[PDB]
Amino acid sequence: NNPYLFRSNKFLTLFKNQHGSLRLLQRFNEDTEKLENLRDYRVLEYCSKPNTLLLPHHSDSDLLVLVLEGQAILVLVNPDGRDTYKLDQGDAIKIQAGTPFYLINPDNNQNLRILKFAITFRRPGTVEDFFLSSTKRLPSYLSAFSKNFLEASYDSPYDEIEQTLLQEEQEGVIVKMPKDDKPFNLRSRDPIYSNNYGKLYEITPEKNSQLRDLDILLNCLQMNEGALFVPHYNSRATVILVANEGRAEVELVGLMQLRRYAATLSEGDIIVIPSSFPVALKAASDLNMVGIGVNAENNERNFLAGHKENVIRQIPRQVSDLTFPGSGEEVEELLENQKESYFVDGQPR
Amino acid sequence: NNPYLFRSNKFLTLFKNQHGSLRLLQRFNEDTEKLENLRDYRVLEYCSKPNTLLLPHHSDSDLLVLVLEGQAILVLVNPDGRDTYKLDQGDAIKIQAGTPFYLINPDNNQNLRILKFAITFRRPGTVEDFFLSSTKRLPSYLSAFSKNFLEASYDSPYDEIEQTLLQEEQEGVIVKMPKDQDKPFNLRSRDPIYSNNYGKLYEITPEKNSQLRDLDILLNCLQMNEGALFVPHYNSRATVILVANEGRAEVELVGLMQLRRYAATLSEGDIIVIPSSFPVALKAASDLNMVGIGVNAENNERNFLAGHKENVIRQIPRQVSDLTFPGSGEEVEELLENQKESYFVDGQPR
Amino acid sequence: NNPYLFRSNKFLTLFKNQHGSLRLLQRFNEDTEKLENLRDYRVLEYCSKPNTLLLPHHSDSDLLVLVLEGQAILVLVNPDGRDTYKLDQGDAIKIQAGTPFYLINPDNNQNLRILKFAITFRRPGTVEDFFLSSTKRLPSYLSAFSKNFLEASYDSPYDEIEQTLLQEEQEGVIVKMPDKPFNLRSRDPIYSNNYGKLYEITPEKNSQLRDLDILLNCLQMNEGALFVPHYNSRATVILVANEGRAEVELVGLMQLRRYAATLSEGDIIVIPSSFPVALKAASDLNMVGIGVNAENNERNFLAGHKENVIRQIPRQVSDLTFPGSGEEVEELLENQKESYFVDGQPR
């Protein structure tokens, strides 16, 4: 029906128990040619309950980890030592491929919800995880080696090695904790658009060294019920837009023939907004959303309504008069009606 | 039959009326595996008559715009203001994806002929254009939005909005202008890299021009006299899309399992693709000028197999020549010394 | 069965005579989707006997040339002049695409064995060579041009041109004779104990490699030695058995699979990024590694004292991850004293 829309039911449950869930969005190009440009990227949700640990693993892929809800303790293990980070809501960090990490929800009441955005390069489109832990679904990758190699390696009898590393200890890879460069925040900077209806924060690869490497931008969209993000488009960034809280009425325009792709988004729903496609966004409730833009370097946002950054207002009358049915002045007058910019009252009068 | 040849009839007419035409060359990889390296690029012709306007639109693709014939006024609109450029014949400029522009042929007699070279990145191989204009073939992309959103957006009744923006005024996206009235750069802005009595070749490399560095492209303007021959050579890295602009060219291309020769006579509007490392030679049937667009251009080097200057065979020592070739070392060295001129030579039969 | 394994018989013999052979490994992705990441690269052997010449040609591809055995005289022809290089065993150089070169084995007794690693960009996965020489298998690419163009070009009669350039002189492309290169072992080895050395040039350290985003390593091990379980973060390494025989255990993936194999002279195993790998020397062996996606690569070990990531996991977390008590784990990882290379002899 709409190829740019990924309902929260298009997520595959990789793992689940009473402690938390790991879910994996289908390939962007599983169902359509129109997203060949995204085939290298995958999205994952990690919901975990209080006082949980995600057992040590490494990914074959680079991860952009982004805390939507709650607080987390991330530990990266390198051959040398280990780095520990408290991530609060809105914090993001890049976990290099090959780095072994584990994740803790310390809060005694607050759930944890984390968005992983995997950049694949080994096998494009596919994310493999390597867990050290023998569990029910899967054993330790150490167990894959022969009796000889393991014994020679650790200078130990296989019986010691098996009873100490390789036997199945835990049921799952999310377990209960005993009954008891750096990260950066989306909203660490001042919002690039901010009036009485909405804020939009944005970190660009131009401004953050972790993102320059990935050629990604992140933005945090906040709006009030009834507010409208007026028609605009990005020059370069293809933005994967994730409904975090609230419901959003989205209208997307594209193309042969002129097509309109509208949808109402609930918590967990994703729409892909290609570069140069005009888009508008009404808040059905107070909502915040999180955007991940690829091909982000040099991105520029052109508006088609409101006072500020309205490209149509920069078209001279002599040209307007020819382009449009209205006279040059008739057009210029209609564009001056709307006083606010970016975010406006989207309520029927 | 010849997969590197794109006749002028391989262009699809996107739009046409009595004011001008916009045409679009088929994908380079539509008909052969042999051009996978070009699948991200598309070529377009814009021929427009005097005192015409191309209505405001933006592309999803980066455009390299290049004026073959005439003069034009290009206006790039940004959210901040707008930039205006006079393009004369041989002028080129990069139009960023997402930039809304319009194009005017002001000359009261001279036609306008422009080459668009689209670098695609959103949907590889595909160029979409977004026109603000309600026309016969297509309505404004603004019209696509709901009655609610449009009204809320412009703070106006839909009646006003439809009559002012969305109603069809113009018949086409090329319209006649009313009666009673970084920066661009020229191919020939530098000195030609090869220049004798038979031919000139101008060349801008990404090494020398910041707009091209980004695209990893080179442009060259080839001029030759009837009967002149561009002697056998090849590029190391650059795969050149070669556009017959004026005159007719006898072209011999050598390639590969099996050894093949891909020859053809080229007319105004014809294109041949000359892969990297493929030996190529080119005789002028008439006085011709051509335009070259080379991809993978960074660090390109041109090796010749004939003439005095830059003839790689002349750099092979006699001891090795004698083994490589049937002739004695000296017999070879003597034969390569015969041809006195370089690059461009007399191509006339004796 | 094992898609990462390329036996020496999987090389296609492009040309052969009593003077030498040119052989070309099948596409990495011919038979499996699991190596999409390598589809731009091709491997070749050039084995030539003493006092031989490889006739002047240019490639459509960038070549990383690497001398496994013997010594060679490489001549690169540019439009201006020519550069001549003596390569000794272990020497490597990048021959840019389009550069015409020829190759000589001057030694009166030693064979020449060269590993060519082609980086393809024109037609991805395909290497074309363009020989100036008329031979039995193929004529000079000059012969392709018309009588007119050739005559006009060299300002000479076709008779002279044909008898001097275009006629078949030689039987084959290997005939009997009448910036700078760098050695794998030019630096100090990054790992060195009583069982093994590993040399490694990274793109970080060598500007010829920075361009190609490649690392090279020279692995030397003593019979019975074991390269303990490790993985690279980013580099996918094409591993070439040069001398000796190696037991290789490679672990990967929906299902957990082990890809073991015994490798002989000429055999290649591809070791993906993030796949744990271990390697026992059945005999004294040396191998050559070509790692792609090499920029910023990091090697994490799962056994031995130094650079063992499992040792950096704290007890409190270990206790949960593994069946053993925190200290049971900590103690077991302390048993093995040496690092990287260990005694692989069974108790």
Curated annotation (Swiss-Prot), chain A:
Residues 4-162, 184-332 form the Cupin type-1 domain. GO terms for molecular function: identical protein binding; nutrient reservoir activity. It holds the Pfam family Cupin_1. The keyword Signal applies. The keyword Aminoacyl-tRNA synthetase does not apply. Homotrimer. Seed storage protein. This is Canavalin. It comes from Canavalia ensiformis.
Curated annotation (Swiss-Prot), chain B:
Keywords: Seed storage protein, Signal, Storage protein. It comes from Canavalia ensiformis (Jack bean). Residues 4-162, 185-333 form the Cupin type-1 domain. GO terms for cellular component: protein-containing complex. GO terms for molecular function: identical protein binding; nutrient reservoir activity. Belongs to the 7S seed storage protein family. This is Canavalin. Seed storage protein. Homotrimer. SMART domains: Cupin_1.
